[PDB]
């Protein structure tokens, strides 16, 4: 589940169609604060499709 | 004796002949790929 | 110690020292960015060419080396120095008179470690500034924390979350409010590695006995314990292709490659760098390529690739062996005569004390060759003498060369060390002739020389 | 690089699909049963007609390919082709048609299993798509025509370059170029995943398995001289006598016992390899008829392995797994052939076990003794461990008449040895 929980994690406002990296993390248009949470969810998602998830691991 | 010339036979006709060329083991040219990566500054984030 | 007559250049011969190389990628290249005592060289990855040195040298010697995209970090004895295209852009100071060890950089946060477990964090002042310019804060780690930093690594997709590795045990550090949030159980084995991994959130630790501890920092508990039979493990790398392949380098020389889908050895390379140098100290793969760029403390730097399965449909049962691909590199041990080969400028021979010689160019830095030492075939018909375990020839003491006819026979006479005839060399061919020349009196040479039109040796007994 | 030689590999690509009627012509005439003018004059339903009786005899005959009727062998699968199938499913057909020639590999001496696979030939193309494991299921069966068929149809991979003179050979080929394919380094290990994958589907027989021994013996014999090739040639048939003897059957067993034996008396190795290999051997013996087999097996992997602590104690977890499998009893019967192997190191090594664990049963030492014939040293390392045993144990008077035995043969070595620990007269008053 999770051994730790960031506490300074939730309360963070990141932007996202500020930079041409993040701007393929959105989901709708309307949408340009995420919260970190939602964020680091989106940005975990775009890392496996970047590196995919070999077998080992699991 | 019919044995060892059985055996004299078994000899002679797993004799080959021409020879079985080995396994090919040749190096290919190998070029530069273009590959993706990860960026840390999406990676880091400000405060409110 | 100024002079009026002469001025440095740049110290021609070298590629590597033993320092953890860094590299950087930059859009579909790799560059290799290694240093070199007080200064620092950036290769090409497809060509092991240089590109950039430092334009000015640095006071101390290089501790440690980071790189991004465009800018690399190198760390001399207090500072740390951000630096584009050998051009000293920007210096950090940090504001202590301890030794900075480990250098980390992810994202607008510089992650500066000293020696004496302290943690120097870096902010960008400007979100679209290029480098961290601004200091922000001043992590410590404790005695009751863990030991000395190992490493300094920041895992993939954690939110200003900076991942430290002491000798005991992991922690992370919430760099924006600067806390520790999560500490790991005790290693009992003193860890001497990590490295990040393509999978998400692990991170892979190589202790000093031959454990890989493979961390999975999400749960806080180990996965995979890869065991090495009493070797030192210096270099973690994982092969980013998408076949699952774990490159530990050892420090005595070994490189052994891991499926870890099998669970099982693939090849265990034997003594790519010499054991007293430190063996192999830094080894990664190009990320996405089957190309692994290795380096050590032996003065060198190679390349091996995975070639592609000969089997058309197995594929990854049947890998292949790594095979050796570009490598350059310069003495082992400091050089002990030097001459020159042309009028030109071009050419210098360097004999050392690592039983070698080599034809280092002044002009292009990749031109250079280590000549070779293959005894050409005796005319008479009988066999030469010598170890059939071939080893190199003794350190070379005096050296002679007339370029005056050159090529069309041998035009270079070395003088060993403690042996009673002296060898010829074929400058143009770079191999060493077929003659050698004895003393007649039973004696050692100790000078040589040749004539100007290059017919005539003469051999000092 | 050039032109043609890119070419090539496009044309390698390329080989299945049809585009003239020339192609078709070169890629309808393989043909595993008719001749060249047969194959190319019939149509899919008419091979197909013979496939459905062939897979409908081959279902009586065994049940598990009841279901390659309905995924392989049903009348939807003639529409389709290989080469109209994307990548996420001609995966898919790949080890499925593997699958089948690993149920089918044992079945080919019946002219229903070549009807059947005659169809597999023609309508997915196998024998230049996955032309691998078609020729690896086959490979025992190289004396007979059906093989020198094979070869006459197939291109060869670049890893069987060995047969390359053998494919439309009026001869077949013969003993010394199959090791000669085998001593390839990297087919070694290709055949590790097939006999791994053969092991896991559970469909491993007699001949494939008589045949991969005969030439796994082969390979390391071959490969006796180079000491640097057998080193690199132990990870491959260990890992192998690993999985054979992690199966469960009567016949990987024995297969295993046979690579154990013959690898360890060509190459000695370290203690604990071999001790590792005790342990696999004794964990799943179960089988009547590999029982003996496992024993001589044991017997010999002892001898190969010389050195200081050859005929040491064996730890307590192999003993006990020893005493369970191997009775006292047992051993003993099998020293009374009057074959009589080579046993004394491992019995050596047994009884000093024995006397270290149980410190319970020496009778069988007694008979241990008077059935074998033992060396000196090995006599002298016994003796020093029973008379440790006469200093701590509450001696019973069976270890007296042990030490009688001791001193009615050769008893200058058990007084030579208590003179190196203790007192000769000493011995009586202790005893």
Same mark, same amino acid.
């Given at each position: 589940?999770?051994?730790?929980?960031?506490?300074?994690?939730?309360?963070?406002?990141?932007?996202?169609?500020?930079?041409?990296?993040?701007?393929?993390?959105?989901?709708?248009?309307?949408?340009?604060?995420?919260?970190?949470?939602?964020?680091?969810?989106?940005?975990?998602?775009?890392?496996?499709?970047?590196?995919?998830?070999?077998?080992?691991?699991? | 004796?019919?044995? /060892? !010339?059985?055996?004299?036979?078994?000899?002679? =006709?797993?004799?080959?002949? &021409?020879?079985?060329? /080995? !396994?090919?083991?040749?190096?290919?040219?190998? =070029?530069?790929?273009?590959? &993706?990566?990860?960026?840390?500054?999406?990676?880091?984030?400000?405060?409110? | 110690?100024?002079?009026?007559?002469?001025?440095?250049?740049?110290?021609?011969?070298?590629?590597?020292?033993?320092?953890?190389?860094?590299?950087?990628?930059?859009?579909?290249?790799?560059?290799?960015?290694?240093?070199?005592?007080?200064?620092?060289?950036?290769?090409?990855?497809?060509?092991?060419?240089?590109?950039?040195?430092?334009?000015?040298?640095?006071?101390?010697?290089?501790?440690?080396?980071?790189?991004?995209?465009?800018?690399?970090?190198?760390?001399?004895?207090?500072?740390?120095?951000?630096?584009?295209?050998?051009?000293?852009?920007?210096?950090?100071?940090?504001?202590?008179?301890?030794?900075?060890?480990?250098?980390?950089?992810?994202?607008?946060?510089?992650?500066?470690?000293?020696?004496?477990?302290?943690?120097?964090?870096?902010?960008?002042?400007?979100?679209?500034?290029?480098?961290?310019?601004?200091?922000?804060?001043?992590?410590?780690?404790?005695?009751?924390?863990?030991?000395?930093?190992?490493?300094?690594?920041?895992?993939?997709?954690?939110?200003?979350?900076?991942?430290?590795?002491?000798?005991?045990?992991?922690?992370?550090?919430?760099?924006?409010?600067?806390?520790?949030?999560?500490?790991?159980?005790?290693?009992?084995?003193?860890?001497?590695?990590?490295?990040?991994?393509?999978?998400?959130?692990?991170?892979?630790?190589?202790?000093?006995?031959?454990?890989?501890?493979?961390?999975?920092?999400?749960?806080?508990?180990?996965?995979?314990?890869?065991?090495?039979?009493?070797?030192?493990?210096?270099?973690?790398?994982?092969?980013?292709?998408?076949?699952?392949?774990?490159?530990?380098?050892?420090?005595?020389?070994?490189?052994?490659?891991?499926?870890?889908?099998?669970?099982?050895?693939?090849?265990?390379?034997?003594?790519?760098?010499?054991?007293?140098?430190?063996?192999?100290?830094?080894?990664?793969?190009?990320?996405?390529?089957?190309?692994?760029?290795?380096?050590?403390?032996?003065?060198?730097?190679?390349?091996?690739?995975?070639?592609?399965?000969?089997?058309?449909?197995?594929?990854?049962?049947?890998?292949?062996?790594?095979?050796?691909?570009?490598?350059?590199?310069?003495?082992?041990?400091?050089?002990?005569?030097?001459?020159?080969?042309?009028?030109?400028?071009?050419?210098?021979?360097?004999?050392?004390?690592?039983?070698?010689?080599?034809?280092?160019?002044?002009?292009?830095?990749?031109?250079?060759?280590?000549?070779?030492?293959?005894?050409?075939?005796?005319?008479?018909?009988?066999?030469?003498?010598?170890?059939?375990?071939?080893?190199?020839?003794?350190?070379?003491?005096?050296?002679?060369?007339?370029?005056?006819?050159?090529?069309?026979?041998?035009?270079?006479?070395?003088?060993?060390?403690?042996?009673?005839?002296?060898?010829?060399?074929?400058?143009?061919?770079?191999?060493?002739?077929?003659?050698?020349?004895?003393?007649?009196?039973?004696?050692?040479?100790?000078?040589?020389?040749?004539?100007?039109?290059?017919?005539?040796?003469?051999?000092?007994? | 690089?050039?032109?043609?030689?890119?070419?090539?590999?496009?044309?390698?690509?390329?080989?299945?699909?049809?585009?003239?009627?020339?192609?078709?012509?070169?890629?309808?005439?393989?043909?595993?049963?008719?001749?060249?003018?047969?194959?190319?004059?019939?149509?899919?339903?008419?091979?197909?007609?013979?496939?459905?009786?062939?897979?409908?005899?081959?279902?009586?005959?065994?049940?598990?390919?009841?279901?390659?009727?309905?995924?392989?062998?049903?009348?939807?699968?003639?529409?389709?082709?290989?080469?109209?199938?994307?990548?996420?499913?001609?995966?898919?057909?790949?080890?499925?048609?593997?699958?089948?020639?690993?149920?089918?590999?044992?079945?080919?001496?019946?002219?229903?299993?070549?009807?059947?696979?005659?169809?597999?030939?023609?309508?997915?193309?196998?024998?230049?798509?996955?032309?691998?494991?078609?020729?690896?299921?086959?490979?025992?069966?190289?004396?007979?025509?059906?093989?020198?068929?094979?070869?006459?149809?197939?291109?060869?991979?670049?890893?069987?370059?060995?047969?390359?003179?053998?494919?439309?050979?009026?001869?077949?080929?013969?003993?010394?170029?199959?090791?000669?394919?085998?001593?390839?380094?990297?087919?070694?290990?290709?055949?590790?995943?097939?006999?791994?994958?053969?092991?896991?589907?559970?469909?491993?027989?007699?001949?494939?398995?008589?045949?991969?021994?005969?030439?796994?013996?082969?390979?390391?014999?071959?490969?006796?001289?180079?000491?640097?090739?057998?080193?690199?040639?132990?990870?491959?048939?260990?890992?192998?006598?690993?999985?054979?003897?992690?199966?469960?059957?009567?016949?990987?067993?024995?297969?295993?016992?046979?690579?154990?034996?013959?690898?360890?008396?060509?190459?000695?190795?370290?203690?604990?390899?071999?001790?590792?290999?005790?342990?696999?051997?004794?964990?799943?013996?179960?089988?009547?008829?590999?029982?003996?087999?496992?024993?001589?097996?044991?017997?010999?992997?002892?001898?190969?392995?010389?050195?200081?602590?050859?005929?040491?104690?064996?730890?307590?977890?192999?003993?006990?797994?020893?005493?369970?499998?191997?009775?006292?009893?047992?051993?003993?019967?099998?020293?009374?052939?009057?074959?009589?192997?080579?046993?004394?190191?491992?019995?050596?090594?047994?009884?000093?076990?024995?006397?270290?664990?149980?410190?319970?049963?020496?009778?069988?030492?007694?008979?241990?003794?008077?059935?074998?014939?033992?060396?000196?040293?090995?006599?002298?390392?016994?003796?020093?461990?029973?008379?440790?045993?006469?200093?701590?144990?509450?001696?019973?008077?069976?270890?007296?008449?042990?030490?009688?035995?001791?001193?009615?043969?050769?008893?200058?070595?058990?007084?030579?040895?208590?003179?190196?620990?203790?007192?000769?007269?000493?011995?009586?008053?202790?005893?």
């Amino acid at each position: 589940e999770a051994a730790w929980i960031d506490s300074d994690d939730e309360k963070i406002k990141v932007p996202i169609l500020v930079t041409n990296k993040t701007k393929k993390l959105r989901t709708s248009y309307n949408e340009s604060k995420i919260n970190g949470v939602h964020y680091i969810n989106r940005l975990r998602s775009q890392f496996e499709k970047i590196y995919p998830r070999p077998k080992w691991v699991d | 004796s019919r044995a /060892k !010339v059985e055996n004299r036979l078994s000899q002679l =006709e797993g004799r080959d002949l &021409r020879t079985t060329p /080995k !396994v090919v083991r040749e190096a290919k040219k190998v =070029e530069m790929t273009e590959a &993706r990566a990860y960026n840390a500054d999406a990676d880091t984030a400000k405060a409110a | 110690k100024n002079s009026k007559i002469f001025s440095p250049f740049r110290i021609i011969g070298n590629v590597s020292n033993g320092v953890p190389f860094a590299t950087g990628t930059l859009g579909s290249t790799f560059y290799i960015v290694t240093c070199v005592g007080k200064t620092f060289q950036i290769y090409d990855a497809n060509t092991l060419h240089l590109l950039f040195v430092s334009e000015k040298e640095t006071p101390s010697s290089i501790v440690a080396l980071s790189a991004h995209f465009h800018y690399v970090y190198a760390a001399y004895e207090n500072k740390v120095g951000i630096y584009k295209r050998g051009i000293e852009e920007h210096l950090l100071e940090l504001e202590t008179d301890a030794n900075v060890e480990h250098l980390c950089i992810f994202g607008d946060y510089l992650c500066a470690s000293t020696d004496d477990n302290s943690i120097f964090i870096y902010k960008k002042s400007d979100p679209q500034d290029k480098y961290p310019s601004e200091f922000y804060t001043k992590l410590t780690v404790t005695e009751i924390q863990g030991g000395e930093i190992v490493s300094l690594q920041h895992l993939a997709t954690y939110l200003n979350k900076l991942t430290v590795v002491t000798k005991s045990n992991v922690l992370l550090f919430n760099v924006r409010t600067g806390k520790l949030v999560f500490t790991s159980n005790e290693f009992p084995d003193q860890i001497t590695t990590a490295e990040p991994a393509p999978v998400l959130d692990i991170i892979a630790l190589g202790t000093v006995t031959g454990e890989v501890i493979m961390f999975n920092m999400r749960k806080g508990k180990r996965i995979r314990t890869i065991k090495i039979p009493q070797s030192r493990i210096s270099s973690l790398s994982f092969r980013t292709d998408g076949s699952s392949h774990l490159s530990v380098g050892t420090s005595s020389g070994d490189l052994i490659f891991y499926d870890l889908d099998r669970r099982s050895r693939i090849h265990v390379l034997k003594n790519i760098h010499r054991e007293s140098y430190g063996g192999v100290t830094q080894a990664t793969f190009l990320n996405g390529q089957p190309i692994i760029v290795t380096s050590g403390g032996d003065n060198s730097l190679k390349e091996y690739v995975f070639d592609p399965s000969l089997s058309q449909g197995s594929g990854d049962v049947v890998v292949q062996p790594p095979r050796y691909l570009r490598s350059r590199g310069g003495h082992s041990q400091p050089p002990s005569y030097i001459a020159f080969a042309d009028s030109q400028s071009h050419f210098m021979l360097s004999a050392s004390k690592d039983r070698s010689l080599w034809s280092f160019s002044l002009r292009k830095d990749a031109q250079s060759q280590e000549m070779s030492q293959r005894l050409h075939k005796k005319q008479d018909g009988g066999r030469v003498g010598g170890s059939t375990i071939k080893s190199k020839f003794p350190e070379i003491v005096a050296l002679a060369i007339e370029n005056a006819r050159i090529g069309e026979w041998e035009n270079i006479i070395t003088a060993h060390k403690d042996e009673k005839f002296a060898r010829t060399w074929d400058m143009r061919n770079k191999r060493v002739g077929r003659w050698t020349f004895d003393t007649t009196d039973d004696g050692f040479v100790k000078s040589v020389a040749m004539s100007q039109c290059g017919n005539f040796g003469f051999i000092g007994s | 690089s050039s032109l043609s030689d890119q070419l090539a590999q496009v044309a390698s690509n390329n080989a299945t699909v049809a585009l003239d009627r020339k192609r078709r012509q070169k890629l309808h005439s393989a043909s595993l049963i008719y001749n060249s003018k047969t194959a190319a004059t019939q149509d899919y339903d008419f091979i197909f007609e013979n496939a459905s009786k062939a897979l409908e005899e081959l279902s009586q005959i065994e049940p598990k390919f009841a279901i390659f009727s309905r995924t392989l062998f049903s009348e939807s699968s003639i529409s389709l082709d290989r080469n109209v199938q994307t990548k996420e499913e001609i995966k898919d057909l790949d080890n499925a048609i593997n699958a089948y020639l690993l149920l089918a590999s044992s079945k080919w001496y019946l002219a229903p299993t070549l009807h059947a696979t005659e169809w597999l030939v023609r309508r997915f193309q196998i024998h230049v798509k996955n032309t691998e494991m078609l020729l690896l299921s086959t490979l025992n069966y190289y004396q007979t025509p059906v093989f020198k068929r094979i070869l006459s149809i197939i291109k060869l991979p670049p890893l069987f370059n060995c047969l390359s003179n053998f494919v439309r050979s009026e001869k077949p080929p013969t003993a010394l170029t199959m090791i000669k394919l085998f001593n390839d380094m990297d087919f070694l290990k290709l055949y590790t995943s097939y006999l791994d994958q053969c092991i896991k589907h559970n469909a491993t027989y007699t001949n494939q398995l008589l045949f991969t021994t005969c030439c796994f013996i082969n390979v390391v014999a071959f490969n006796s001289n180079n000491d640097e090739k057998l080193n690199q040639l132990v990870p491959i048939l260990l890992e192998i006598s690993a999985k054979l003897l992690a199966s469960k059957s009567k016949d990987c067993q024995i297969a295993a016992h046979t690579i154990l034996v013959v690898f360890a008396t060509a190459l000695p190795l370290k203690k604990t390899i071999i001790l590792a290999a005790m342990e696999t051997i004794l964990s799943n013996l179960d089988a009547k008829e590999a029982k003996h087999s496992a024993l001589l097996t044991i017997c010999k992997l002892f001898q190969t392995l010389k050195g200081q602590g050859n005929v040491d104690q064996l730890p307590s977890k192999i003993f006990k797994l020893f005493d369970s499998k191997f009775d006292t009893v047992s051993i003993l019967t099998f020293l009374d052939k009057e074959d009589k192997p080579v046993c004394d190191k491992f019995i050596t090594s047994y009884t000093r076990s024995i006397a270290r664990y149980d410190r319970s049963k020496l009778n069988i030492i007694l008979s241990l003794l008077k059935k074998i014939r033992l060396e000196r040293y090995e006599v002298r390392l016994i003796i020093t461990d029973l008379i440790y045993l006469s200093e701590i144990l509450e001696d019973k008077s069976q270890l007296v008449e042990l030490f009688e035995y001791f001193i009615s043969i050769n008893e200058d070595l058990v007084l030579k040895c208590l003179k190196s620990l203790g007192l000769t007269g000493x011995x009586x008053x202790x005893x």
